[PDB]
Design a protein around this nucleic acid. Structure first.
Ligand code: CL
Ligand code: CL
Ligand code: CL
Ligand code: CL
Ligand code: MN
Ligand code: MN
Ligand code: MN
Ligand code: MN
Ligand code: MN
Ligand code: MN
Ligand code: MN
Ligand code: MN
Ligand code: MN
Ligand code: MN
Lengths: 85, 92, 108, 99, 91, 104, 77, 96
DNA sequence: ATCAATATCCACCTGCAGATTCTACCAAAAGTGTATTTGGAAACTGCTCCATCAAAAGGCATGTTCAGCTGAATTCAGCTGAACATGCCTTTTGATGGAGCAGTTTCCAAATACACTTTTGGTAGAATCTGCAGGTGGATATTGAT
DNA sequence: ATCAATATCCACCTGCAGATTCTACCAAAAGTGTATTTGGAAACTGCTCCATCAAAAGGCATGTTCAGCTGAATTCAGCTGAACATGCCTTTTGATGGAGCAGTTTCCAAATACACTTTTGGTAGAATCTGCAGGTGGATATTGAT
């Protein structure tokens, strides 16, 4: 119903990635970092979303919840605070 | 529609340690996440402990050992002291 | 009938011993649960909460604020060696990071 | 009479101080939301999201990237550089056990 | 006294490699392996059941647990085997 | 007849059922859960023993030893991932020399 | 007693780890690292031992202690 | 007299020890260390022998893993020689 | 890149010690035949929130130019760390007692389970309360070209 | 050894979005009584471990020599940061349907419970047969003199 989504990884822009690196303390950035970062992100996101949906399907739901994501993130060895209830 | 949470207790503790300080709702959410996280860590470690020792009962002893296994150093000693105190007072 | 007293006031606690007991029963952690277990656990949960709130309140006032926000919690956790260890794989939403610039990056 | 111009690095350092002091999300929300929906759409069609689920995903993703960039930065510096490069990212992820 | 998966691991060994044996130490590693994966799957299935306020671990929690814990092809393959076994059993 | 034989399995369905009932996992355990779990466990065991058996005979040994399990596991990307934080005692490591360390 | 972990022992560990050349300062550095690790693991192992009211550290005590290090050890069950 | 060039034997030792699985630390000093450290946590401890061997398998796998990462750090910096700073970068990125 | 010379790695061998496989006894666990209860799924349905779009304003992404300074390449030697011979001492391997833990069994006092009934702390929503976000302006460390 | 151009710091202000307090019903904790499970004290008993003693082998400590790796010094091309114009699309705030969570109620398919028999898996010695300790020869590298 909405316009088919395509090529949205490019929404993670060069200046956004630059900001993320800055918060991470990075002063200077190779031109090739941007595509590398997109790839790394896509993989992380795919994996987390993959697991979240597995929780959503298991519950016979159509709506991914915040807790689905919180549990999904455990497979990445990450505990996310702030999204219960 | 009724949802329980640790919010009122976290706020009571807050007023104890910083009587004139408040807390945002998002921060309260991080605290509720924290309490639930540690609850499951301690409870799970105590459960595995009881099972390793073929006891069907989680007692304060399993809780104490789980706490020593999960917490670093000084934090562990301090927590064990609080818990031991609460148990002795309670049983009195 | 004797006048009710909470297990929490009996143990000298703010955190809810009865609720902790119920949560222990329904998490299938063991087939039986000792009388002191929920008390000890409520007391540890309460204590750790006090520790994080103490440090976070301190950051809040070192920033001229009367209200703790996620940032204060993050500052509290990451500047304390043991909390930082305990919560090493935890992400605090809206926490940001510690101000830290590597010395080699500073100007000449 | 020439216009004033900071030297390379000065503004970069200013930006580091700026974003390390703040906590706002650094990726634009609506583009991030499109990314999440595109990816999820490829696992199961017509999914809906709680609003907070999208925000949970964005908090976890930005925390992850900033952490990776801290490690990456250490790798670049180890090699006597100041500029992060793909091999820095790859070493970080290898030692982290992601690769 | 003490139980182990040794005779079952040895039966599987004989199906896949009829003339091959296994040292005591290697058998100890196989037993560790089976207990480890048992606890991962059983534990994940349990937390899943609880997350959904169900008191029963069924094969559906096992299947979902397997999808959460195993990578890729191993996941698809394990799920097919589990499903086959339940179907044969229920016959 | 045993439940294991009804399921086409070698792994013990009854033992798995009992271990689930008494491991404090849930109040109840469905009839298909131990069948499913025993089958998953059997499948992974066969996968590892197949590969380790191959290494064992590529070293001309009739008996699988921990080395062979380590070789089987680390040379398979999925097994290696599943077992990424596991130490196999007396397994050693994969022969691996970084190319830059070689002469010429 | 930490000096009982000799230079050639450490060097053998490095070789198995694929290292061709080794700084003189590695041995002390490695000893420090080893010590920390051993301390942590042993501390938890004994915690299990104490919990069971035993005086004897068992292999399984060690195996369980190693889980806190996020390490799973196969072969001692 | 014959003399191998620096590096040749090193490489040979790498092939040798990567092919083998034997414990690389001497048993008695390791055992002595374990008992010493154990003293600071609880008095009058005994050890099962297999507990000591469990501790040694774990310690050696840990160290071998750490050296692999350490080596990757040395090589990153265009060296072939591992240094304390390599170990320290490795442990920092591991979260140790 | 040759030969010649040299050292080490790697099948392949045998004999036999010992590690694995086979065997048989037997508690303990699984199976079995019946009986009984109950979790959760289906079928509802109310009613949150979610999807999507709208408009408008301005924050920010993009693309360009240009040059400062970074990374990459190169050179060279001081001194680190490898390789090797020698001979001592620490570990290894094997023998022997015996003290002291684990591991058990019985059996009651004490602990915990769990239903029933009663009370009150916790919640949701309403009503109050107030920090601090932005907004404005001036002071003030900092930067870079002179 | 300055200034001009900038960015950043620091009070001070107020309104209202978000936080805290108030209110009152009721879900769940608590008090009470009865049933069931368990912990540990006492009295065992083998059997792991610790202590001790001993010889000897091979691994290590040490000292020597020098190959070649690291780090310093140097040079330069072109990448990446800084800054500016342009104009898009994100943000913000609100609308409009309606998908799909949740809340209820009913009631079997599936699960537990229990008494008892049957089957099996763990154990420890016997019987089998693999690996391994050394030994040899061929394949394979390495090193140095040209
Ligand atoms: Cl208790
Ligand atoms: Cl690169
Ligand atoms: Cl089932
Ligand atoms: Cl160094
Ligand atoms: Mn798609
Ligand atoms: Mn009945
Ligand atoms: Mn019901
Ligand atoms: Mn440079
Ligand atoms: Mn020279
Ligand atoms: Mn009240
Ligand atoms: Mn402000
Ligand atoms: Mn009611
Ligand atoms: Mn049998
Ligand atoms: Mn040999």
């Amino acid at each position: 119903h909405r316009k088919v989504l395509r090529d949205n990884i490019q929404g993670i822009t060069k200046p956004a990635i630059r900001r993320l690196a800055r918060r991470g303390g990075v002063k200077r950035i190779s031109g090739l970092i941007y595509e590398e970062t997109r790839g790394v992100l896509k993989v992380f996101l795919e994996n987390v979303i993959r697991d979240a949906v597995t929780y959503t399907e298991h519950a016979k739901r159509k709506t991914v919840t915040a807790m689905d994501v919180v549990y999904a993130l455990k497979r990445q060895g990450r505990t996310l605070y702030g999204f219960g209830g | 529609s009724r949802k329980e949470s640790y919010s009122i207790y976290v706020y009571k503790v807050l007023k104890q340690v910083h009587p004139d300080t408040g807390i945002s709702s998002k921060a309260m959410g991080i605290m509720n996440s924290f309490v639930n996280d540690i609850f499951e860590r301690i409870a799970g470690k105590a459960s595995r402990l009881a099972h390793y020792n073929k006891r069907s009962t989680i007692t304060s002893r399993e809780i104490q050992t789980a706490v020593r296994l999960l917490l670093p150093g000084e934090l562990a000693k301090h927590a064990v002291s609080e818990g031991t105190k609460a148990v002795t007072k309670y049983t009195s | 009938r004797a006048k009710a007293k909470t297990r929490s006031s009996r143990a000298g606690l703010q955190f809810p011993v009865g609720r902790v007991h119920r949560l222990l029963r329904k998490g299938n952690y063991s087939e039986r649960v000792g009388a002191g277990a929920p008390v000890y656990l409520a007391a540890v949960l309460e204590y750790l909460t006090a520790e994080i709130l103490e440090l976070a309140g301190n950051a809040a006032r070192d920033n001229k604020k009367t209200r703790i926000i996620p940032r204060h919690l993050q500052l509290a956790i990451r500047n304390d060696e043991e909390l930082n260890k305990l919560l090493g794989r935890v992400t605090i939403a809206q926490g940001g990071v510690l101000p830290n610039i590597q010395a080699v990056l500073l100007p000449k | 009479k020439k216009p004033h111009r900071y030297r390379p690095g000065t503004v970069a350092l200013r930006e580091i101080r700026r974003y390390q002091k703040s906590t706002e999300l650094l990726i634009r929300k609506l583009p991030f939301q499109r990314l999440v929906r595109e990816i999820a759409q490829d696992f199961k069609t017509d999914l809906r999201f709680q609003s907070s689920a999208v925000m949970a995903l964005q908090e976890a993703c930005e925390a992850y990237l900033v952490g990776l960039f801290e490690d990456t930065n250490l790798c670049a510096i180890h090699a006597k550089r100041v500029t992060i490069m793909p091999k820095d990212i790859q070493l970080a992820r290898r030692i982290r056990g992601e690769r």
